[PDB]
């Protein structure tokens, strides 16, 4: 009974997961297919914002 209801809830969550999983899978695909980045840009900006005050 409620066990059945819960079986549903679990089923839904599992869907939501594979939903999310797909969205991700796609983004990764669009990403792979094309060819800077903010990551190294921060490191560079700290190297400058530092040796400016040093200098």
């Amino acid at each position: 009974h409620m066990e059945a209801e819960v079986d549903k809830l679990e089923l839904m969550f599992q869907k939501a997961e594979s939903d999310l999983d797909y969205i991700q899978y796609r983004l990764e695909y669009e990403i792979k297919t094309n060819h800077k980045n903010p990551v190294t840009l921060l490191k560079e900006l700290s190297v400058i914002k530092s040796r400016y005050q040093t200098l």
């Binding site: 983004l27 669009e30 800077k36 840009l41 560079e44 900006l45 200098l55």
Partner: protein
């Protein structure tokens, strides 16, 4: 950490991880972001050359203040010389 909470964190991680891989796609594909990203990246190269210039101008500036001191020194010797004598 409850089974409930642990689930949530599983969710937020999947959610968050998308949003990051999302911004990674946006910033590396969509043009308006991609320019402002190169505009920063270019302006890093210049603000880097502006450092090298500030580097030499410092090791120059010093070397004059060095001479502009070493002059001032010798110039209080030849005065204390003329202060004692006349």
């Amino acid at each position: 950490s409850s089974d409930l909470e642990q689930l949530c964190s599983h969710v937020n991680e999947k959610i968050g991880n998308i949003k990051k891989t999302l911004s990674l796609r946006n910033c590396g594909q969509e043009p308006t972001l991609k320019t402002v990203l190169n505009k920063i990246g270019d302006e890093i190269i210049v603000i880097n050359e502006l450092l090298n210039k500030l580097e030499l101008e410092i090791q120059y500036q010093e070397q004059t203040n060095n001479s502009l001191k070493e002059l001032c020194e010798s110039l209080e010797e030849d005065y204390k010389d003329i202060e004692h004598l006349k």
